[PDB]
Design a protein around this ligand. Sequence first.
Ligand SMILES: OC[C@H]1O[C@H](O[C@H]2[C@H](O)[C@@H](O)[C@@H](O)O[C@@H]2CO)[C@H](O)[C@@H](O)[C@@H]1O
Length: 433
Amino acid sequence: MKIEEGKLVIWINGDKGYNGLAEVGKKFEKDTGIKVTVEHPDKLEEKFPQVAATGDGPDIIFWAHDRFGGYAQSGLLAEITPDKAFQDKLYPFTWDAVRYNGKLIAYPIAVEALSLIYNKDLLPNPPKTWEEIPALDKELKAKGKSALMFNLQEPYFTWPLIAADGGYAFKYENGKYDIKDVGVDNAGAKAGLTFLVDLIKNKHMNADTDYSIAEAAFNKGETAMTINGPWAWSNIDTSKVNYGVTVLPTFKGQPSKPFVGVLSAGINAASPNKELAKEFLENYLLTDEGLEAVNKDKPLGAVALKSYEEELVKDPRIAATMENAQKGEIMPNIPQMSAFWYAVRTAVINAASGRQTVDEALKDAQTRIKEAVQKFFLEEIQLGEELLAQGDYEKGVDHLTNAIAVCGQPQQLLQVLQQTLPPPVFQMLLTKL
Ligand SMILES: OC[C@H]1O[C@H](O[C@H]2[C@H](O)[C@@H](O)[C@@H](O)O[C@@H]2CO)[C@H](O)[C@@H](O)[C@@H]1O
């Protein structure tokens, strides 16, 4: 319990280059004395918030930035304090992905986006744009031995299709997300998922296809294309398949819109080694030499460090990654992203398996998301009132702002609060808007 005392523990997903990370740690331990222990547990993005509520867990946790707003919101993450000189060394937009309540809550590392990966021997010239070729993606598989295999179990991999003709998580009106304008239930979304289920009903894909199956199929030459991120490339090299990495096909003339993750590194708020964790991230990991050591293990994508990214952009595969990234959307980092992912994972699994229709499946996902934002609103009103009565006004009012962010009529609620708050507390609330 309460790990540890003068060492660093890091968690990263088992699909990343954790051996390369451990190399950077050794170098850290050599220059310094401080041992670095890198682990790759399962469901780390769900294990993390549990054990960090304990006050336990790792010092540093790696995940895509979408989860981090939820951690920050629960107070599991220390604010980070790069000094301007250092902020200049990373791209502004990666710095935006790790901003929550106007505070930086992680160090951005890399930009990950899915791409179409194809076997050049089986298939020189991959199915363009889809969109006279989904008839022919459908038919390209008709020259059987399998045209396409990728992970149906995780909705990250199916979203690019669900979103192509208008599906979406939460609407932007010009910046602020309108949580409760949810788009998993709409025409665009129903059509993309329908097309997916039709691929399965016509026997071009198996609904039980997972990560390892698809990885294995492509790596043995049994299928002509997979959908995957840069981490997968090193295995494909090892497999000695002659492969390309290209743009995802379009749907109804429109590009596939992947959700783009920025692999990020948060510092546990309960960590006793926050200054050590900072020296490592800024002065070891985030260096040309640190990122190359991770990248040689499993490629990172387009790194957030400019000096190093200036070399990687000469790789066509990285050009392919960035096109797809540009055509898609950078993920929200808001706490509701969790409910979104879980709702949609259930919709995709159920429709593919046949347990519900496309429509029923997306409407139950739409409903679950709305219910999660509503639950969260009640919680935050309650929390808000309590941490006022205990005189922790700054936190007390922070929860009231959270509630207002997800409200039906936020103006009606602002009135009630000026009526129930003492004026200084009300003013202090307006600063947290
Ligand atoms: O499938 C939902 C899942 O999508 C994303 O997870 C990605 C992760 O971002 C990638 O770095 C890589 O690990 O593949 C994962 C997909 O299995 C979101 O990051 C995640 O929060 C979400 O649950």
